[PDB]
Design an enzyme around this catalytic site. Sequence first.
Site, PDB file in Angstrom:
ATOM      1  N   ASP A   1       2.166   3.668   2.561  1.00 42.84           N
ATOM      2  CA  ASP A   1       0.960   5.036   1.975  1.00 42.84           C
ATOM      3  C   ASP A   1       0.935   6.051   1.287  1.00 42.84           C
ATOM      4  O   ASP A   1       1.602   6.594   0.609  1.00 42.84           O
ATOM      5  CB  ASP A   1       0.159   4.899   3.222  1.00 42.84           C
ATOM      6  CG  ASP A   1      -1.240   5.489   2.530  1.00 42.84           C
ATOM      7  OD1 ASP A   1      -1.009   5.804   1.306  1.00 42.84           O
ATOM      8  OD2 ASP A   1      -1.750   6.379   3.387  1.00 42.84           O
ATOM      9  N   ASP A   2       1.388   7.729   2.383  1.00 45.23           N
ATOM     10  CA  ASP A   2       2.771   8.156   1.164  1.00 45.23           C
ATOM     11  C   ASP A   2       2.984   9.242   2.169  1.00 45.23           C
ATOM     12  O   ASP A   2       3.761  10.261   3.392  1.00 45.23           O
ATOM     13  CB  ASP A   2       1.264   9.669   1.597  1.00 45.23           C
ATOM     14  CG  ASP A   2      -0.193   9.025   0.681  1.00 45.23           C
ATOM     15  OD1 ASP A   2       0.657   8.959  -0.648  1.00 45.23           O
ATOM     16  OD2 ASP A   2      -1.476   8.429   0.616  1.00 45.23           O
TER      17      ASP A   2
ATOM     18  N   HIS B   1       1.682   4.748  -1.939  1.00 46.39           N
ATOM     19  CA  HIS B   1       1.178   5.387  -3.989  1.00 46.39           C
ATOM     20  C   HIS B   1       3.216   6.212  -4.466  1.00 46.39           C
ATOM     21  O   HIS B   1       3.149   7.439  -3.558  1.00 46.39           O
ATOM     22  CB  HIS B   1      -0.224   7.122  -2.781  1.00 46.39           C
ATOM     23  CG  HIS B   1      -1.310   6.119  -2.659  1.00 46.39           C
ATOM     24  ND1 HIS B   1      -2.394   5.547  -3.766  1.00 46.39           N
ATOM     25  CD2 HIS B   1      -1.580   5.855  -1.611  1.00 46.39           C
ATOM     26  CE1 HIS B   1      -3.158   5.419  -2.360  1.00 46.39           C
ATOM     27  NE2 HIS B   1      -2.624   5.314  -1.771  1.00 46.39           N
TER      28      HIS B   1
ATOM     29  N   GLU C   1     -10.581   3.521   6.163  1.00 49.00           N
ATOM     30  CA  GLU C   1     -10.109   4.993   6.639  1.00 49.00           C
ATOM     31  C   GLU C   1     -10.625   5.409   7.065  1.00 49.00           C
ATOM     32  O   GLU C   1     -10.777   5.693   8.195  1.00 49.00           O
ATOM     33  CB  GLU C   1      -9.262   5.117   5.291  1.00 49.00           C
ATOM     34  CG  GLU C   1      -8.278   6.152   5.807  1.00 49.00           C
ATOM     35  CD  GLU C   1      -7.025   6.476   4.262  1.00 49.00           C
ATOM     36  OE1 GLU C   1      -7.603   6.478   3.287  1.00 49.00           O
ATOM     37  OE2 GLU C   1      -6.154   7.335   4.478  1.00 49.00           O
TER      38      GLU C   1
ATOM     39  N   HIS D   1       0.649  -1.314  -0.016  1.00 55.54           N
ATOM     40  CA  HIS D   1       0.104  -0.032   0.020  1.00 55.54           C
ATOM     41  C   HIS D   1       0.598   1.189  -0.168  1.00 55.54           C
ATOM     42  O   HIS D   1       1.209   1.896   1.029  1.00 55.54           O
ATOM     43  CB  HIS D   1      -0.860   0.340   0.821  1.00 55.54           C
ATOM     44  CG  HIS D   1      -1.847   0.859   1.596  1.00 55.54           C
ATOM     45  ND1 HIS D   1      -3.082   1.058   1.818  1.00 55.54           N
ATOM     46  CD2 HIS D   1      -1.755   2.162   0.839  1.00 55.54           C
ATOM     47  CE1 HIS D   1      -3.591   2.266   2.482  1.00 55.54           C
ATOM     48  NE2 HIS D   1      -2.995   3.334   1.551  1.00 55.54           N
TER      49      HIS D   1
ATOM     50  N   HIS E   1      -8.849   1.001  -1.222  1.00 49.31           N
ATOM     51  CA  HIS E   1      -9.397   1.556   0.174  1.00 49.31           C
ATOM     52  C   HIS E   1     -10.345   1.448   0.513  1.00 49.31           C
ATOM     53  O   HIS E   1     -11.548   1.540   0.008  1.00 49.31           O
ATOM     54  CB  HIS E   1      -8.926   3.518  -0.665  1.00 49.31           C
ATOM     55  CG  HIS E   1      -7.557   3.518   0.100  1.00 49.31           C
ATOM     56  ND1 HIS E   1      -6.746   2.420  -1.243  1.00 49.31           N
ATOM     57  CD2 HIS E   1      -6.670   4.497   0.192  1.00 49.31           C
ATOM     58  CE1 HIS E   1      -5.519   3.010  -1.136  1.00 49.31           C
ATOM     59  NE2 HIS E   1      -5.115   4.460  -0.768  1.00 49.31           N
TER      60      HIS E   1
END
EC number: 3.5.4.2
Length: 313
Positions: free
Chosen positions: A274-275, A15, A196, A13, A193
Amino acid sequence: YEWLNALPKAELHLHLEGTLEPELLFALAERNRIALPWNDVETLRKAYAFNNLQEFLDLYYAGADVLRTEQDFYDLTWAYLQKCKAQNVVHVEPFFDPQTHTDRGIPFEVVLAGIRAALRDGEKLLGIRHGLILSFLRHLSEEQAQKTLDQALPFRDAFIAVGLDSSEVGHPPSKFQRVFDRARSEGFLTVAHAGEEGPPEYIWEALDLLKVERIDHGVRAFEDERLMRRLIDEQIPLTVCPLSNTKLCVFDDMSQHTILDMLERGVKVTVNSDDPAYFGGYVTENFHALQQSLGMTEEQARRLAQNSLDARL
Ligand SMILES: Clc1ncnc2[nH]cnc12
Ligand SMILES: [Zn+2]
């Protein structure tokens, strides 16, 4: 930490657009001759304060401006593959958001060329296996997604799955059931997703409607026992993101995070960043926050690392 960093892991996961470091952002702007709103790296870095998903998103998309050439998309991907090497991520199944770029005029083929190139370098030089995932922007129409899937059809062997990200609440998985149907039909696996910011309901929708192979995030499942029992029973993987959830206020503190809880319950949870450019940590820094704020043990360390291997597509 160095022990956590030494563990072998998979990142499932992540990005690519969210690995965009403030330093890289400024450099790509300079190369592309782009006047940024932000005065310096430090001012942009200070802007990474969020009260929710959307505030992050608005920023995250604004940053995509500097992404314009194959070499830009190479630089971005390769920089992250290097972090993977440093932190012994031996495998990646990363997201990208084609529409963020194609809607800005960049040809689909350019985006793919630069990422693909990087990924080839990743495996031949770094020993990192990859499974690219193409994500749809969920705040936009299913029509727009369909149009994107059409662009991807000739390239379909470049992607192991289609994903679903962006503003979750008010855009349920059902919104995209036809394109997902069509995607699977054309031979894509699927992920999404769910839970969340959105309710557990969205997670049943992902499982049953969109027929995902793993739930991205998925933390709000904790409010639904019937769901829990299913997760635990079907050993459906969850790609959980500690720093992201803290930064986005899904949890008010890391001590409130439920990922270990789930783990001890038998849920097949994984640790992902994730980010990382926006949440201040790559995968190892996530494991470490678990240890610091939840006394995660080396025991559970190895266990979460192993799930990320088991859950690979
Ligand atoms: Cl974690 C998450 N949720 C919704 N949209 C996103 N774009 C990049 N990461 C995202
Ligand atoms: Zn995400």
